[PDB]
């Protein structure tokens with residue numbers, strides 16, 4: 499059930515597709531980044547076409563839409579990483595088992611590209627290049643996190659196994675989200691850029 | 694995609710079904726257990742019907758069936774646990790983030806035993822305040838495996854020059870496997886819960 503805007507993959511199940519500058523899709527992703535990172539230079543934007551990761555993510559989306567009884571469970575967020583982690587994320591997505599983790603032992607995503615653009619996250623490589631993903635994240639129903647969580651808290655400790663979907667730094671005005679399960683986040687675009 | 698022999702759950706996403714001694718379904722699990730645990734006695738065997746865990750696991754199985762040549766990717770293995778963990782495993786499955794360090798570590802992941810006698814150790818199936826021990830019977834996507842190492846947080850690569858193309862699982866011994874370790878969510882479906890006593 500591969501999305502229409504994906505380009506043909508000659509019957510393969512993984513491809514990184516470089517976007518054409520000045521076309522609709524590239525302009526949309528560039529604008530999301532330049533909202534907070536207009537001082538940075540974009541070398542390229544690639545679309546991640548990973549059929550298996552997409553399948554597993556879409557199953558978790560359909561389940562969360564049923565569980566929560568509404569369809570507003572997805573946000574587009576940013577994730578900076580080092581060059582040596584890019585092949586793993588492209589093929590396998592995000593892994594909590596692989597910086598501060600003050601809101602719990604999960605994978606962190608930023609609302610603002612400027613946060614992910616810090617050298618501690620998007621570490622410049624031996625050529626000065628920095629790497630940041632644009633990510634579809636199933637944030638669903640969220641609560642404030644805290645140090646040492648291995649899953650989100652329960653919604654009511656009367657039923658300890660009915661969990662929040664994610665945690666955040668601030669519930670009224672979130673700037674980051676943490677997810678604790680595989681296939682709750684789909685890396686959709688990779689931005690390669692310089693300071 | 695829910696199996697046609699499951700009980701009708703009437704819109705519900707989750708149910709535990711108590712099996713009847715003398716049914717083939719009960720007897721096969723009883724025999725699999727008693728092969729190595731004939732000193733213990735079974736109280737009851739429950740079929741775990743968890744729609745979401747089943748969906749996510751069957752998607753992973755179809756993907757491993759495509760990726761691997763013509764491999765039998767699935768084994769039926771045992772997992773002992775404490776009573777405090779049973780409600781979470783029934784609803785959410787096996788979380789590597791909650792796993793203990795094993796007395797012989799082949800990596801940081803969830804451990805599954807070939808023999809019920811391994812899982813029947815008090816270290817894993819801790820007796821509760823009523824002297825009941827709990828063991829799951831689990832469908833596990835072992836796939837293509839190699840001998841593990843204590844340092845691992847994912848299975849190792851098949852080829853050191855292609856670090857992202859990974860083994861599916863690791864074992865203690867490739868020639869005579871007695872334990873498997875998996876490192877990803879929805880690679881194991883808790884199928885039956887055995888409640889047993891001395």
Ligand SMILES: O=C1N=NC(=O)c2cc(OCC3CCCCC3)ccc21
Pocket residue numbers: 576577578579597598599600601606607608613614615619620674
């Ligand atoms: O883009 C990111 N890539 N990798 C991260 O680990 C990461 C982490 C992150 O917030 C970490 C949080 C910040 C406030 C204090 C506690 C810790 C935000 C973005 C990122």
